[PDB]
């Protein structure tokens, strides 16, 4: 009830004008304010079902942090659920890498890492786990800041996803302790799963693709569980600080794995006080 209206027909304010891409629960649309020309991202999802999607709305409604996409409004009108979300004009980091046909520089990765850790430290304070970190779910502003989007869905919506034969892709970023899991238990170290995913996200940004990228998807699950933690392919190309950060983050034991707060003290990120590296990257991509 709290964050979803049944009164205003969205079409009065918002026009669906395009597609931005595909998330974990289908299409993400571009929406335009008809009077001002101001932009939003949007879900438009065709009473049982209405209740199930609300869990996802409550996550964005609950977060007041710059590095998590804002909820602008939610409407139920004519059998459709509209979720209006902050538009990130820089787009997804994996799209930037596709557009420029290369990985991020270390300074670019350091800005992304610093901001992702601040977001994750905030999320742990709310006892919210993202559950699906990857470069495709890290969005950019033109000013050069990140926004996390596409929070991992509920048990109910994963059920509806499988019953309608939709994917969310091979889980290359998944922590070893939960790679065989359809749904995860509530545990004291559940939230540590995002720290592993952050480590894999950094490697994906360094090398364009995550580890085990071409393995059979069932073999990926086994490799994540069984393999030594992944390292950068060419360690000589990256600072000792980057490699050390990855080595402490990609701990297969979720108890000993550091928290976001602990990793914010690491020299790889503790002195990152400018987003300029990322501002310039987004400027490069917007040119292409
Ligand atoms: C809310 C909700 C409800 C239900 Cl019931 C189920 C799941 C979810 C969670 N899904 C999202 O938060 N998706 C999302 C929400 C917003 C955006 C992107 C999103 O995903 C990733 C899509 O791929 C990237 C496509 N390029 C861009 C470019 C700019 N921008 N600016 C915002 C988003 C975005 N996407
Ligand atoms: Cl989505």
Curated annotation (Swiss-Prot):
Region (Activation segment): 150-199
PTM info: Autophosphorylates following homodimerization, leading to activation of the protein.
Annotated positions binding ATP: 20-28, 43
Tissue expression: Highly expressed in rapidly proliferating tissues (spleen, placenta, and peripheral blood leukocytes). Also expressed in brain, heart, skeletal muscle, colon, thymus, kidney, liver, small intestine and lung.
Modified sites of kind Phosphoserine: 166
Residue ranges constituting the Protein kinase domain according to the UniProt record: 14-269
Compartments where found: Cell membrane
UniProt-reported outcome of changing residue 252 to E: In TGCT; somatic mutation
Residue spans crossing the bilayer: none
Record-annotated active site: 132
Disease link: Testicular germ cell tumor: A common malignancy in males representing 95% of all testicular neoplasms. TGCTs have various pathologic subtypes including: unclassified intratubular germ cell neoplasia, seminoma (including cases with syncytiotrophoblastic cells), spermatocytic seminoma, embryonal carcinoma, yolk sac tumor, choriocarcinoma, and teratoma.
UniProt family annotation: Belongs to the protein kinase superfamily. STE Ser/Thr protein kinase family. STE20 subfamily.
Subunit structure: Homodimer; homodimerization is required for activation segment autophosphorylation.
Additional remarks: Inhibition by erlotinib, an orally administered EGFR tyrosine kinase inhibitor used for treatment, enhances STK10-dependent lymphocytic responses, possibly leading to the aggravation of skin inflammation observed upon treatment by erlotinib.
Cited function: Serine/threonine-protein kinase involved in regulation of lymphocyte migration. Phosphorylates MSN, and possibly PLK1. Involved in regulation of lymphocyte migration by mediating phosphorylation of ERM proteins such as MSN. Acts as a negative regulator of MAP3K1/MEKK1. May also act as a cell cycle regulator by acting as a polo kinase kinase: mediates phosphorylation of PLK1 in vitro; however such data require additional evidences in vivo.
Name of the protein described by the UniProt record: Serine/threonine-protein kinase 10
Gene that specifies this protein: STK10
């Amino acid at each position: 009830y709290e964050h979803v209206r049944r009164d205003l027909d969205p079409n009065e304010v918002w026009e669906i004008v395009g597609e931005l891409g595909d998330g974990a629960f289908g299409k993400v649309y571009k929406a335009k304010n008809k009077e001002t020309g101001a932009l939003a991202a949007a879900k438009v999802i065709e009473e049982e079902e209405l209740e199930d999607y609300i869990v996802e709305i409550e996550i964005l409604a609950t977060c007041d942090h710059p590095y998590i996409v804002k909820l602008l409004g939610a409407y139920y009108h004519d059998g459709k659920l509209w979720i209006m979300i902050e538009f990130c004009p820089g787009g997804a980091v994996d799209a930037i890498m596709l557009e420029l046909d290369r990985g991020l520089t270390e300074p670019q990765i350091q800005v992304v890492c610093r901001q992702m850790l601040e977001a994750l430290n905030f999320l742990h304070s709310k006892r919210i786990i993202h559950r699906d970190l990857k470069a495709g779910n890290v969005l950019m502003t033109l000013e050069g800041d990140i926004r996390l989007a596409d929070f991992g869905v509920s048990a109910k919506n994963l059920k509806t996803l499988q019953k309608r034969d939709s994917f969310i892709g091979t889980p290359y970023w998944m922590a070893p302790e939960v790679v065989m899991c359809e749904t995860m238990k509530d545990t004291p170290y559940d939230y540590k799963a995002d720290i592993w995913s952050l480590g894999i996200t950094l490697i994906e940004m360094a090398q364009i693709e995550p580890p085990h990228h071409e393995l059979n998807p069932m073999r990926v699950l086994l490799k994540i569980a069984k393999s030594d933690p992944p390292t950068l392919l060419t360690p000589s190309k990256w600072s000792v600080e980057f490699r050390d950060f990855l080595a402490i983050a990609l701990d297969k034991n979720p108890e000993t794995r550091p928290s976001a707060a602990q990793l914010l003290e690491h020299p790889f990120v503790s002195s990152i006080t400018s987003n300029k590296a990322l501002r310039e990257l987004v400027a490069e991509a917007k040119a292409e």
